[PDB]
Amino acid sequence: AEPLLVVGLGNPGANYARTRHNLGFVVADLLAARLGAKFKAHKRSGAEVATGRSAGRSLVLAKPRCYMNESGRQIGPLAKFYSVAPANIIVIHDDLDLEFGRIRLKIGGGEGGHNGLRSVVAALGTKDFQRVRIGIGRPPGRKDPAAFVLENFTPAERAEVPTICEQAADATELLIEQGMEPAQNRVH
């Protein structure tokens, strides 16, 4: 299909930039840095975008600018704006169901309790869209991941986040360049 869109999820505000639920943004910024682009306001979607290309291929890096719950209300207009089909949309996000640091790639599947993802699946009218899942761990047997995703990483996890984002950024580039997975080694 063609035009490409990479969306990083997260909440706004400098106070949320470091939280576990903002890995998508961090990886987004990382990719914008890589590829030498800066984010600009997108009045058609309300979100901010960065444009450039990874190895010859046209990209559109975006970050929503609203609360996580409303991700789709901006993403949907964004995919519509650039004539971008779901199969070609790639959303980066923290995943409560994967071991901290473990990066797995897929199209379809569940949202893993991610409110930003439900919004996206709701807005695009499909679950078929590519995801760069980045494990953050999960509160222990029985519940409340919600508050957990709004916490910053522990100092221990903090020493690893930079490396995990570099790998998640590479995984994205690979997806775009070759598809499927084989970047899923075990950062168990």
From Swiss-Prot:
GO terms for MF: peptidyl-tRNA hydrolase activity; tRNA binding
Industrial or biotech use: Might be a good antibiotic target especially in combination with antibiotics that targets 50S ribosmal subunits (macrolides) or target peptidyl tRNA drop off (lincosamide clindamycin and aminonucleoside puromycin).
InterPro entries: Pept_tRNA_hydro, Pept_tRNA_hydro_CS, Pept_tRNA_hydro_sf
Site label Discriminates between blocked and unblocked aminoacyl-tRNA, positions: 11
Residues annotated as site: Stabilizes the basic form of H active site to accept a proton: 94
GO cellular component, one term: cytoplasm
Main localization, broad class: cytoplasm
Chemical reaction(s) catalysed: an N-acyl-L-alpha-aminoacyl-tRNA + H2O = an N-acyl-L-amino acid + a tRNA + H(+); N-acetylglycyl-tRNA(Gly) + H2O = N-acetylglycine + tRNA(Gly) + H(+)
GO biological process, one term: rescue of stalled ribosome
Keywords: Cytoplasm, Hydrolase, RNA-binding, tRNA-binding
Gene3D superfamilies documented for this protein: Peptidyl-tRNA hydrolase (3.40.50.1470)
Database matches in SUPFAM superfamilies: Peptidyl-tRNA hydrolase-like (SSF53178)
Pfam family membership, one: Pept_tRNA_hydro
Coiled coil: none
Induction behaviour: Constitutively expressed (at protein level).
Phenotype upon changing residue 101 to D: Complements an E.coli ts mutation
Entry EC number(s): 3.1.1.29
EC top class named in words: hydrolase
Binding site for tRNA: 16, 67, 69, 115
Effect of gene knockout: Essential, it cannot be deleted. Depletion experiments lead to decreased growth. Depletion experiments lead to accumulation of peptidyl tRNAs, in particular all 3 peptidyl-prolyl-tRNA(Pro)s, a reduction in usable aminoacyl tRNA pools and hypersensitivity to macrolide antibiotics that target the 50S subunit.
UniProt subcellular location: Cytoplasm
Active site, UniProt feature: 21 (proton acceptor)
Quaternary state and interactors: Monomer.
Role, per record: Hydrolyzes ribosome-free peptidyl-tRNAs (with 1 or more amino acids incorporated), which drop off the ribosome during protein synthesis, or as a result of ribosome stalling.
Assigned protein family: Belongs to the PTH family.
Protein's recorded name: Peptidyl-tRNA hydrolase
